[PDB]
Amino acid sequence: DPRRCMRHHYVDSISHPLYKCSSKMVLLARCEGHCSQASRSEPLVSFSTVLKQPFRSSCHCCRPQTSKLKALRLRCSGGMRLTATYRYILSCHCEECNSGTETS
Amino acid sequence: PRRCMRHHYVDSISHPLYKCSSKMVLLARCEGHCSQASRSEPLVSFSTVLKQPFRSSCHCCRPQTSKLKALRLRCSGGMRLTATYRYILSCHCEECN
Ligand SMILES: [Cl-]
């Protein structure tokens, strides 16, 4: 299967959203693809004194499995040094939509 | 065919805490493969701008509309206990969050 959950590389320029700084081009990684598992949702039955959520669901999303934190210094007007930080995704995997993970 | 779709089925319902005679009910569920790829990419944080590590997108086959329904169970001692559930009328692909 070629369209499966996969790591893809790309480049983006990192710039501060408010301060007009010295933007920098960086190589980044993202997770992308189609998880093989179908997503589903079915009703849960409630009874007297036994209340449950209306639906029980399953859904798999292509998300980061491992990553490495990186930081880089930008140069801004006129001498300000700002650190920017982001995760460099090392591997991807399919995981439940509602998993309690940092991506959730 | 494999798209996000309504599927019908029947299930036997029993009260988990009370002795009741099971009852068969017609149910609907959502199931399928949403067309959109799911993805997750990093968010850039700065010294005073603290963000989640990732920005993600993911589509799930879930109920779009539904109807609350109810039925009377027959239980021990001529007791009638209520059970309730949502009957899914339509399905669609929706963001995980
Ligand atoms: Cl129907």
Numbering used by the authors:
A (entry chain A): 35 to 138
B (entry chain B): 36 to 132
From the paper:
Norrie Disease Protein (NDP) gene encodes Norrin, a secreted cystine-knot like growth factor, distinct from the lipid-modified Wnt. Unlike Wnts which have promiscuous interactions with Fz receptors, Norrin specifically binds to Fz4CRD, but not to the 14 other CRDs of Fz and secreted Frizzled-related protein (sFRP) family members. The Norrin mediated pathway maintains the blood-retina and blood-brain barriers and regulates angiogenesis in the cochlea and uterus as well as neuroprotective effects on retinal neurons. Our crystallographic and solution studies further reveal that dimeric Norrin forms a complex with two copies of monomeric Fz4CRD.
We determined three crystal structures of Norrin, using selenomethionine-labeled protein for phasing. The Norrin protein fold is identical to that of the previously reported MBP-Norrin crystal structure. Each Norrin monomer comprises three β-hairpins (β1-β2, β3-β4 and β5-β6), a β7 strand at the C-terminus, and four intramolecular disulphide bonds. The two monomers assemble as an elongated, head-to-tail, dimer stabilized by three intermolecular disulphide bridges (Cys93-Cys95, Cys95-Cys93, and Cys131-Cys131), in agreement with small-angle X-ray scattering (SAXS) measurements which showed Norrin dimer in solution. The dimer interface is further stabilized by extensive hydrogen bonds and hydrophobic interactions. Superposition of all molecules in the asymmetric units from our three crystal forms with the MBP-Norrin structure showed an average root-mean-square (r.m.s.) deviation of 1.5 Å over 190 equivalent Cα atoms. On inspection the superpositions revealed a high degree of conformational plasticity in the β1-β2, β3-β4 and β5-β6 loops. The flexibility inherent in these regions is consistent with the relatively high crystallographic B factor values. Conversely, the structural comparisons underscore the conserved nature of the interface at the dimer core.
